[PDB]
Design a protein around this ligand. Structure first.
Ligand SMILES: CC[C@@H]1[C@@H]2[C@H](C(=O)N1Cc1ccc3c(c1)OCO3)[C@H](c1ccc(C(=N)N)cc1)N(C)C2(C)C
Ligand SMILES: [Ca+2]
Length: 223
């Protein structure tokens, strides 16, 4: 997260860290046994880390649970990042509490100007590499489709939206991928892609979760 603030330990209880010996992506807990992340975060050997604040210190409230299966959207395209969403099933059910809790899926899409919360342990610098120990937060609005498409002509599908600041300085970045975009208590996006981080006229691009609710529900019920 570039231009953000320290969230505060466990203030974002649905945030997860995907770990393979190091933090490489975020995700969101959507019930006690399933996490939603980005398809481009797929790899084998994932451990899901719940209840984290400092990702380098065991502080208490952590739960570490292996992934049993990761389900990349069958129509995910690595070239265009269309349908950049993946479901992860935990080997065992998480213990839900005030520090580890699920986030609701939306029943409708959010509109332009809606203010959302974005969170992650990604790079905090637009020039250079600076990863934080603790979780960072950013409030960002959903941009209009016209502005999104003007920023990235021909690259925006109906499964993507832009959020952020055209003046630059505030954005998600490398290591935030897969993490949540939460608006009015609902998961509306997943950190997917962008052009650099926090550069002018190049906002972040996010997977539009409201387009996938029926797919998520159908897939969880059959797995
Ligand atoms: C595997 C995808 C990777 C991903 C993704 C990212 O941007 N990628 C490149 C990309 C750029 C434009 C595209 C595209 C892929 O497909 C269609 O158009 C990601 C990224 C995520 C968010 C932001 C940002 N908010 N500025 C910035 C970067 N990066 C840190 C990578 C991990 C390499
Ligand atoms: Ca920790």
């Amino acid at each position: 997260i570039v231009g953000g603030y320290t969230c505060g330990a466990n203030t974002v209880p649905y945030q997860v860290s995907l770990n393979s010996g190091y933090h490489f992506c975020g995700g969101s807990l959507i019930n006690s046994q399933w996490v939603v992340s980005a398809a481009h975060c797929y790899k084998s050997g994932i451990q899901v880390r719940l209840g984290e604040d400092n990702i380098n210190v065991v502080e208490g409230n952590e739960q570490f649970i292996s992934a049993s299966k990761s389900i990349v959207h069958p129509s995910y395209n690595s070239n265009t990042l269309n349908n950049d969403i993946m479901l992860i099933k935990l080997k065992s059910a998480a213990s839900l509490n005030s520090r580890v809790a699920s986030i609701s899926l939306p029943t409708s899409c959010a509109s332009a100007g809606t203010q959302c919360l974005i969170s992650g342990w990604g790079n905090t610098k637009s020039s250079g590499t600076s990863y934080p120990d603790v979780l960072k937060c950013l409030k960002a609005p959903i941009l209009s489709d016209s502005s999104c498409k003007s920023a990235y002509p021909g690259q925006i599908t109906s499964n993507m939206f832009c959020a952020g600041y055209l003046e630059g300085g505030k954005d998600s970045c490398q290591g935030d991928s897969g993490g949540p975009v939460v608006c009015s208590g609902k998961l509306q996006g997943i950190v997917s892609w962008g052009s650099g981080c926090a550069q002018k006229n190049k906002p972040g691009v996010y997977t539009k979760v409201c387009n996938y609710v029926s797919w998520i529900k159908q897939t969880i019920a059959s797995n």
